[PDB]
Design a protein around this ligand. Structure first.
Ligand SMILES: *[C@@H](O)[C@H](Cc1c[nH]c2ccccc12)NC(=O)[C@@H](NS(=O)(=O)c1cccc2ccccc12)[C@@H](C)CC
Length: 220
């Protein structure tokens, strides 16, 4: 595979969003991956509605601000026959009744693909598909305060993931410890967190924080 990938340079990625005080990370991860695959198909990048997913994908297993999964969101888009744009169905950071309107649907999918639980497989997917939805263990103060560099948390779990994010690429940079590889990850905590809303997470370090343990993307 390539040694470095960044889908932002190819037009696949919307600006960083902010989920607010609502456990809807799974919906931001899902819209990020679908934004990328829709752009791959149509050449048009359109921001998609996380609120549509929060309010409407309960029947697929999601629980609004109380948690969810990207695959359940991809299934909703397929079952429902569409997903509204961000502009038409804006984000409110609280669960409400479903207000989906098919007239304003701008995305579709025909299912999804789950990636094997190996960083080598995640790398192949990122290199060939586009941005990939992943789940990570983000439950450490070091993640809240991250500013720059490669994030490595010795107490991170590869089995207890609690936060959905989007891998938009990978790369390397020289470091003190010579652990130089990273996943380029888009978060949904606004642009004031991290590096403009992004984090470089340790790559090829025993599946650090579980980044390869629940990776998937929608089929468009
Ligand atoms: C991210 O904003 C969100 C925060 C959140 C809300 N509730 C919980 C409970 C445990 C951990 C994290 C939580 N995280 C998630 O949605 C996660 N999904 S989950 O599989 O841990 C999950 C937790 C609670 C309820 C439900 C309901 C349906 C499906 C899943 C869950 C992460 C892993 C998303 C990638």
């Amino acid at each position: 595979a390539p040694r470095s990938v960044d889908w932002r340079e190819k037009g696949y990625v919307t600006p960083v969003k902010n989920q607010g005080q609502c456990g809807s990370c799974w919906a931001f991860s899902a819209t990020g991956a679908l934004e990328g695959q829709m752009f791959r198909k149509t050449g048009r990048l359109i921001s998609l509605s996380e609120q549509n997913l929060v309010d409407c994908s309960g029947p697929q297993g999601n629980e609004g601000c109380n948690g969810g999964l990207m695959d359940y969101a991809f299934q909703y888009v397929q079952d429902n026959g569409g997903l509204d744009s961000e502009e038409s169905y804006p984000y409110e950071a609280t669960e409400e009744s479903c207000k989906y309107n098919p007239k304003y649907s701008v995305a579709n999918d025909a299912g999804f693909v789950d990636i094997p639980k190996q960083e080598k497989a995640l790398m192949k997917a990122v290199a060939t598909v586009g941005p990939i939805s992943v789940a990570i263990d983000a439950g450490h103060e070091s993640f809240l305060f991250y500013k720059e560099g490669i994030y490595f948390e010795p107490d991170c779990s590869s089995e207890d993931m609690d936060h959905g994010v989007l891998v938009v690429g990978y790369g390397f940079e020289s470091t003190e410890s010579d652990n130089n590889k990273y996943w380029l990850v888009k978060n949904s905590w606004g642009e004031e967190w991290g590096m403009g809303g992004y984090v470089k997470m340790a790559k090829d370090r025993r599946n650090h924080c579980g980044i390869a343990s629940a990776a998937s993307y929608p089929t468009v």
